[model samples]
Target: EAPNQALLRILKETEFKKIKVLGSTVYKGLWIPEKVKIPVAIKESPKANKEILDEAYVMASVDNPHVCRLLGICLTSTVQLITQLMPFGCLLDYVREHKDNIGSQYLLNWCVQIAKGMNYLEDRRLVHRDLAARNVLVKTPQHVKITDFGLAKPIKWMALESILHRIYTHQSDVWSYGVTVWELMTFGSKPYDGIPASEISSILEKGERLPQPPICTIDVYMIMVKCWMIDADSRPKFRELIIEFSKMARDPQRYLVIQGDMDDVVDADEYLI
Candidate 1:
């Protein structure tokens, strides 16, 4: 009831040594913790959003390896989110460094790992709202973790409805996941390249989507197609994604054989309501 005495001690100004700047106040801190030193990201939001900390609560509740943990919070001036750090940095930046030479197996594995983390979030009813390769953290060429929970948006990775209506949903996330797949294969190439954000809606309204990336395989590309379905109801759920992709990850034959045509882009405005 006294706000966890340990949290009080750890929340002190001195415990957090600023490591990097995020805007004016938000930052990445190396939390000393009086026990161990680790890099932790800190955000300063008003006390009113303390309830939102529960999202972090639910986030850390599970021990899923792919998802990062929120280690602590401070309720006074800010609702601090102390999440684990990924040394390899953001997946987007990592891809840019290796895009032209990454292995096919490594790329497939990245797909599975992200799907596993996203499925964990889905089962917990926590929508990332902004799921993209840029939001994912690369711990190793083989290890990846989902990161950034402070309403992050890569802009180019946003789902059509989220951009147009300002709505956020798991289904919309799936749409972004489609774009994320595009990002992974293209090595951070901009989705809808050469097209401004203002024109994306009209283009999608015509049932048009981004073309395949240069090195993208047919099977992996088809999964992206399933996620890009016009109706949210048509997209695969996160669990379904994990299962489907896990199978693809395990069997080269299955992946090569599991190909399908993109659904006809018809009147998707039926879902605009």
Candidate 2:
């Protein structure tokens, strides 16, 4: 009854922009609140459903406290519940609306901020699991936040387990982050538009790489590629990724590369590289 009361209180207090409370119950003496939400927009990704809900629950349960702080929460206990209202601002469709003057440099900077937030998560042994552009939110030119903890999880200490295990991991987040970088450079093109999700697993298992950032500089592409490495162990940590992005942001050449061209430029190589 206490847990049920707590969940109901949370639901009533928070203003969820994209999620709806569908049903709730007390199970095993614990309250479980169920909700239906709009699928975070992705061009080719699988539809979000019960599986995503479970993943989000696991992620929110573990790292929501820390994430809330990164999003500007200053209190204890309250921060944990605050994460429930995190809005999905990183969706490609959402970013597309501001493409007019935001420019590529702004997008790159947005990615940097997201990387820093991710570093905060990694430092605490948590992984976002889902680090796509759709999962990140932009608060301002210099402020960005990662959202959707549904897919986030902690690193497992044990190895040699079944590959089919659906648990989230840091490496998986790194892979997704790389794709997000690609999306930034391309002005939010859907990843693997024609490829199916089942094929994505096989492609990734075979070391299929994301195509290089279309209008970005070589350094940018390299960094993203590093993040997308098939071997999770080989992926650069967010700490390192943040430093690299910061360096790029300070360079005038890198900053100029993404200016004025937000629309899909078919020949981005001529202007970006």
Candidate 3:
């Protein structure tokens, strides 16, 4: 059961101007009322379905800083879902655009934020089947918001079970999150680069995963590897993941080797050759 306010917010005509396509057949636009500055986006469904409304209710039920906020929905000519606008755009574009400018600290924090959001969804039994860098929005300049994304495919970000049996459980999302982390560390490089989509299974069958992202620390890479465990149940839960990430965010020096840490900057363990 959803709050009555959520249902009331459903506007038949709230004046949302479509500025851009946000994919998933969604749009980047806003409902201009002059007095309020509510940056928002909208998604239009081809037809009316009760299930869509039910799903929208569940999404709106979520409350977390890291998760994108749902504003309202319209079911007039077509079903439309309105959500907050993420000014910084999706993670893939943001990371690639500012790779040289953004340091590892900011990048590390974004991963923690993403994990925090996923953990929230998991707690409520919601699964983001398409968790990836492209689906994550860089909300404002302060936080990253995990956006809803996906469709049919011989997709790139899927787990082995998802690829083989089309099964999409939270565990599968864990696998995609690992690949998303790879994208983060590599500054948005394509996963399984050079491998044709149809032959991905053969590569996975050989127990192969992407080579380490050169920019990431050994500890960070270790988490990515753990996420790719052959047995889905073996992967860390979202709650478990956020806990690990929080530790790293608290003391990056313990987990990361920043440029300052080089030359033994005063240490003998690391050599700069």
Candidate 4:
């Protein structure tokens, strides 16, 4: 227990050069190691010490290719969580900015990577209460990493049980993952776009869901449909999602080929090379 005290202030303000301020609690910064300068994202909370430490603990415990890596922690006047810098920033903004430049293959790869990371979390029985495009960081167009654990739940993404009873389970995470995929398909459009937050539960209760994105194929849209199933027990697990997404990623011709007869198929002009 005391060994954690060893996390004493190892990073100094002078050592870190601020690149961009992400929010009140987070920032993008740079630091020089013994050999070279490196960029890192820092989340510092002056009041939420426990939350900061809890996130650090969880991040340090698991290492997955698609999960953000905790480089270290800084214990100074406030708790600072330092992690690998995702130069492209969160998946949400990254997708929105590059909407015209991105292709379906990259989008499908992101789904597989996110599912693979979530499968690892599910295997450890760890629930990521908040899983969304906003929480996922884009390292490169082809790579992404999940971040922002141990944070407040965003009401809009909550599962039906989570919204009504405040009950949370791995399945709830599955529901959020489904929304995240929707965000990807729509190039980061807000979920439930026009609905008020207070009325979201009612919408879920009525068996309504976000309509399929214009660009999303039936195969991909069906996965989100399965995840939004009212019964938590009926939702597919992360492992199953990973398998399905992995197949699609490897065989895009089989899964992503559009039906010529579909009324909503995206125009060829809009398809990015």
Which clashing pairs does model 1 show?
none
Candidate 2: 10-residue stretch with minimal lDDT: 25-34
Candidate 2 backbone collisions, by pair = 55-150, 56-150, 90-134, 91-134
Number of the top-ranking candidate, with TM-score as the measure: 4
- Please, what are the lDDT tens digits per residue for candidate 4 over residues 125-244? 678989999999888788888888885228788888999998888899999999999998888899877778999989888889989888767888899999999899999999899889
Candidate 1: which stretches are off by over 4 Å?
1-10, 19-29, 43-63, 74-80, 152-155, 164-167, 251-273
Order the candidates by lDDT, highest first. 4, 3, 1, 2
How well is each residue in 109-227 modelled by candidate 1, as lDDT tens digits?
88888888888777666678878887898766788888666563255666777777887788888888788878887778878767887887778878887787756567777889888
- lDDT score at residue 18, model 1, on the 0-100 scale: 75
lDDT of 3 at 138: 77
- Flag the better candidate by lDDT, 2 or 4: 4
> Which candidate comes out best when scored by lDDT?
4
> Which should have the higher TM-score, number 2 or number 4?
4
As for lDDT, the candidate ahead, 1 or 4, is: 4
- In model 3, the runs with Cα more than 4 Å from the true position are 1-8, 12-27, 32-35, 45-55, 149-154, 253-273
| Residue-level lDDT tens digits of model 3 in 1-273 | 333353325764656678788776778775644244455677773334555565577556766788876677887776777777777789999889977766666767887889888888777677788888988987654688887733311377889888889788888888988999889888789997788999897788789888878766788898998899889999998888888887787876666554543111211011111
- Report lDDT (CA) for all predictions: 0.69, 0.51, 0.74, 0.79
Give lDDT: candidate 2, residue 32.
18
